[PDB]
Amino acid sequence: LVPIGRGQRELIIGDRQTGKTAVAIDAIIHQKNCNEQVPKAQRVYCVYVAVGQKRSTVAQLVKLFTQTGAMRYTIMVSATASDAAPLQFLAPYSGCAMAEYFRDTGKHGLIIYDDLSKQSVAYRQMSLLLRRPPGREAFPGDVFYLHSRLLERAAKLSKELGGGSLTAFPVIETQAGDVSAYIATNVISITDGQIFLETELFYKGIRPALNVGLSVSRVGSAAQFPGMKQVAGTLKLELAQYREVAAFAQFGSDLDAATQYVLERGARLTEMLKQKQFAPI
Amino acid sequence: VGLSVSRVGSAAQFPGMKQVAGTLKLELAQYREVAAFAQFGSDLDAATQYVLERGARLTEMLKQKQFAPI
Amino acid sequence: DVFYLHSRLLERAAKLSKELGGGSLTAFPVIETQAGDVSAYIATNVISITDGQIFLETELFYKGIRPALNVGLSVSRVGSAAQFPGMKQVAGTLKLELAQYREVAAFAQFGSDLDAATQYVLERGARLTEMLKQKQFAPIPIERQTVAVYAATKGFLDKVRVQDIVAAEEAVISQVNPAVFKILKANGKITPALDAHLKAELRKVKLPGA
Amino acid sequence: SNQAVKQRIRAIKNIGKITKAMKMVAASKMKNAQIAVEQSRGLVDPFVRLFGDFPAVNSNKSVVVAVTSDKGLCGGLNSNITKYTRATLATTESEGKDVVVVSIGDKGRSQLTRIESQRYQLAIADTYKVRVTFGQASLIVEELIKHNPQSYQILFNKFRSAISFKPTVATILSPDLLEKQLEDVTGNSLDAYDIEASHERSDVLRDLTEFHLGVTLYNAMLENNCSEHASRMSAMENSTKSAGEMLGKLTLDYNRKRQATITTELIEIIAGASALM
Amino acid sequence: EAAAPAGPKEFTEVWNKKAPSTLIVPEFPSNYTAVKAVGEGQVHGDAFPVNFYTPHSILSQAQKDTVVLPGVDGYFGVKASHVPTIAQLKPGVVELHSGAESEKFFVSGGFAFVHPNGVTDICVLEAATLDQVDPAAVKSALAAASAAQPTDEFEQAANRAAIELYSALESAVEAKA
Amino acid sequence: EILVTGIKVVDLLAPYQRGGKIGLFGGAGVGKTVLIMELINNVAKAHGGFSVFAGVGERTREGNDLYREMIESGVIKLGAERGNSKCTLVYGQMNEPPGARARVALTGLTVAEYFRDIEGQDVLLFVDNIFRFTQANSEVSALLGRIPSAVGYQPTLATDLGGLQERITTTTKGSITSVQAVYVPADDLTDPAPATTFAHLDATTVLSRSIAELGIYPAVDPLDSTSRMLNPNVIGAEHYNVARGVQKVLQDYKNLQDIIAILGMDELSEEDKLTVARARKIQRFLSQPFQVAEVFTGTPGKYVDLADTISGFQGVLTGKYDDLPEMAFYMVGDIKEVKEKADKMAKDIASRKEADNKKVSEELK
Amino acid sequence: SIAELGIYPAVDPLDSTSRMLNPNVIGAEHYNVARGVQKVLQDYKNLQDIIA
Amino acid sequence: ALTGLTVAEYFRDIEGQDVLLFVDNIFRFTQANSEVSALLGRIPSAVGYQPTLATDLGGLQERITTTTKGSITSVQAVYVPADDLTDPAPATTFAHLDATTVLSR
């Protein structure tokens, strides 16, 4: 539904404990499964930047990337919560520089900035203690330039420069599904796509809790699988029809034997897009 | 019409227009109270349907056409 | 530091140990709330300082239920099992019956479907919430409250309908022989001899609802 | 998140005017369909003072009808009839008697199948779309006569007033299949009357019970329609109450969010200005 | 032979055993009628209660002194303490009299009962006053009704009812008083 | 590895880790001190290590209550038996100045970190209101000449809180199971101090006031309480499937509640009526009497084993207990007691009289 | 809202204005069809809260 | 409003009368004192008001009382800002009010 090309930056935005990291860990583990099958030139080397997290949270990911085997291709840049505020502000740039090595020398990179919303809090702390005057919520004026300097480094290079690529997955945590925040509306404006994960879809069983009505991909049908370009065009065409009819039929007024078809078919597709935790298909 | 007022009011109205606007605004107040129920046409009420029909008449009266003042 | 303002104030309300004299200090902070918003800043500050709350509602106060005590929200956990023993023997049934009255008023805010056992808990709850409401500037001693809620959480008032309960409890306080108030004050609780004399004395009471 | 609350106030306020419209619609339909209900109430009386009222009779075959509403905002009317369906359908059960259950109205088609699915045979629906006429009740009586039981049961709501609709079971027995067999005491009570038919008494009762079924079915589905409209008028009365108390809670919480928005934007502006001066 | 003596009272007693007890007894059509057949009285001399009914109307319920009913043997009349009767009516004129004044309803047929207590319940489907029929369309329709004569005894029985109702309407409209 | 707490909603929906940071999130009067006391009573006796209770910014009356009840149950021993004590108390209660309440959590951490690093064994650290640490540094930070951050807080909220929280871990040489009560300032879970401390915990049990106002205690929001242990490779697929099915039923009822409040339950589907009935039963079944609440509720408390929790909630999910009413599930231990209370409520539907004569309270008894 | 329906270009017909929408600029046959299309799309939105 | 108060306090304290004071729009008194508090560079309190809102209102309203000489009875028109009674200017005014007379259309 929201396919991702190489060189595209895609925001994984969601509320507090949705499946945001689990979407990004599955993108990294899956590159291990593809790197064994592709030739050496089109292998994707992943970098996971862990900003402001626990140190034992990232120790659970090194243990997961080891026992899957993705740590052969993975760099982890870990600026935990006990690190200084300039080490968490600068760790997305350090991870982007470690991943720009593969972009600049003709290979392919995958950078994941887990909680850019925790990098901007580390940036706000230095800016308020360097006595730079605060703006919205307290943030510095240049906090759009903070993230657009960083996400614009994810590019698909020309073939003169090697044809290399760097694909970004910034993660932004919202508060109550409020994407109208300051840092949220900045990164929505920077990145191409958006994977919006909803906490109410999470508990209905739909995991990955992807809001299919709000999740975009600006590259779109340009860089998806051609075998699923001709199948998932019909899939989003039906799930768009599922959404408005279920708003009416939960009142329980009346049903129409083809309105009955679209909320019975869209339930086949909603259960189809569910998935387990660490098994990329 | 519900939110537009004049604290001077009808003391500075054209007399003759004051003869007819005083019942025009009452008819439009009754129409605004029974408004948004005009989608119930098959579900007719025969006392509020008259003020609903006349309110739909009178809102079509006060429309104008852009730099043709009357 | 507006939490610290009230916390360092109310923490001085203590009960001292016997090595410090055994003195006490009971605090009643009062917080005005805007439109019932208990989730305000200063309100939730003082709620997390004090040992309980007494919630007084505008919807009970406008109806004349005065004091307008929100029984589902009011709480006092440190004073519980430290109250009057006769009142503790009587009032658990009162808290439970007002709880079930709140349940069946939470189910039926409009009256058309009557189970006739739900009508019983409705009539008992309406009797008890007429019992607990009182007038201003006249506090009652605890034995005259114990006997008054003893006469209500039991029978003895179902003859009286819903209006004359304010006169019924005054008739009960007046016509009960005032020795049983002295025994209830002195003993601390209703002894079974006193329960016998109290069941006896609540039968020769001339209720105004007749 | 401050615009989610404003659009939720928008939703609750439009719901609260929709339900206030439907309350007045149901009240309008209740008065101009009560002028047809107590007109048809008279003709049920000669058949009950001629044939009597025999609900608990040991029928071999029985067709029970629960006539319910078509539209669904009636508010627990059809469910009350669905429960009195089994409450009066278990009081027939004395010897293992056959029962056919039949529902008039779309909201009885969905509700009897949860409780009695093997004994369901027919769904009459779209009956109150234009109006209720006696030829219509005659055709429904015809299709209830295609299979020919010994008794008929009609369950509906008797429109007493706009407040009470205490439900009714009306019973119609096949002509001498059980009806005159329920009449013979030291002789009979039907033998007082001089049958002035063309053919025998066994055919005048055959015509007379089909006419009684048509009259009872017509009055049942007319009284049920008027009690449906009054039940909807009382159901959308509580809906505007709920959509007003929810609106008032949402308006109070919006006022809190408005005040907090002005305070937080002001504290941001003051902190920006104080870091320069 | 009548070993199941039912009623509202027996159904009340048995229904308190198999239904849940909180459910009030379902009402019965007996509970809205104060008038029965075996309940003696309601006579008072010369005028008797005539319950002229209709599915879509109640045309009369006050007491009248003589009713001319168009039974299938022929027109008969009902005075006050008449014999009990269950009379099927052919399409004819039900005459209600209160004295010199007569209101003439031409009905479509349908039964008319006289009970032991002197109450009479005329029960017909379409019961028009004879004022509101035109004398033109009846022979205009009977000319076609005397033409389509098929072997289909459903349609032929409908034609028989058609020519008989139309003939009775004609013979009642030429014979006005 | 799981930490069994004997609490139905905690063990079912957000199970605790034996070396994990656990947070209890609440809004002034929803029950996180009562939950932290019940967790003390259930966990800190089977767990054979040492305990540290760091009281930060709470009532002095509650510190005296916990101290006296620990002397009673022998967890704390006085005099020459002092070496057989199991708990050590560090107190910075709400009468202290802001500098004292800003450092007392570090004192309790130091006492816990000695037992973790030097004695090399498992510690239980209970911190009542780690929010008061952040609030105390926010009182202090105004007078230090700092530009304030969001809502009113210090610019260093995340880093002060993270520097305190990253010390509270289990290392390779010892364990600290941490339970922190977290206060939410105006029932505002988006306030920067709760929103910052959400990312430091392995299991976040969020207590709601709307759950508490329905009488359901512990007032745990089941659709807001999470764990890293709710993972089928960690707890087993039986537990995980029961927990996710319970959450699916509760979320479906939450989506229906806006319709039910307006149009009533008469407008629902029969499928919707089934899920509303089942969800009301599993809402009441998540409530539980506490042993520490019985001194003011009067109902004795129940420790519900985890196997009983899984089996009972699976039975209420599949529809094995649709025969029982809603209030049979309210404030009972396990599914044996639902059927016991459902027999008893039904039994008391008749027995309401015959206290007429034959008394022991006539004049000469 | 227009984009989630799949109507592309997702131009809000009511909210999009121009100064070229006078009848003395673009003629009356253009002006009255544009205003009629807007009126039909507006009272559809007033009905849409009751269709749902 | 203080000038009107002084004229009323002369009739109370020297003439010994039951004076009537009419503060026309007490909310505009609040709004004016909020403006002079904003212009003197003070940090505004809640929603936007002066930090001294309760005392700048109570300094006016506490001079309206009954003395032993006479009294001042004040009839103050009250405007409620966003039809919001929990706004701090009417919530501070309503603490001082002893009666409301709502005039209805």
Ligand SMILES: Nc1ncnc2c1ncn2[C@@H]1O[C@H](COP(=O)(O)OP(=O)(O)OP(=O)(O)O)[C@@H](O)[C@H]1O
């Ligand atoms: N596709 C999935 N299927 C089942 N469970 C899932 C899935 N994705 C995530 N989960 C569960 O949801 C919980 C939260 O996942 P995750 O760690 O991704 O949250 P998050 O969005 O990263 O929030 P935070 O950054 O606060 O941890 C995890 O414990 C995981 O077990």
Ligand SMILES: Nc1ncnc2c1ncn2[C@@H]1O[C@H](COP(=O)(O)OP(=O)(O)O)[C@@H](O)[C@H]1O
């Ligand atoms: N499990 C429970 N059973 C009964 N009452 C409870 C329970 N939990 C909380 N309460 C009630 O909630 C009140 C506040 O709980 P407490 O933990 O003291 O508040 P806080 O969450 O502010 O620390 C208690 O006084 C108690 O009455």
Ligand SMILES: [Mg+2]
């Ligand atoms: Mg994460």
Ligand SMILES: [Mg+2]
């Ligand atoms: Mg506490």
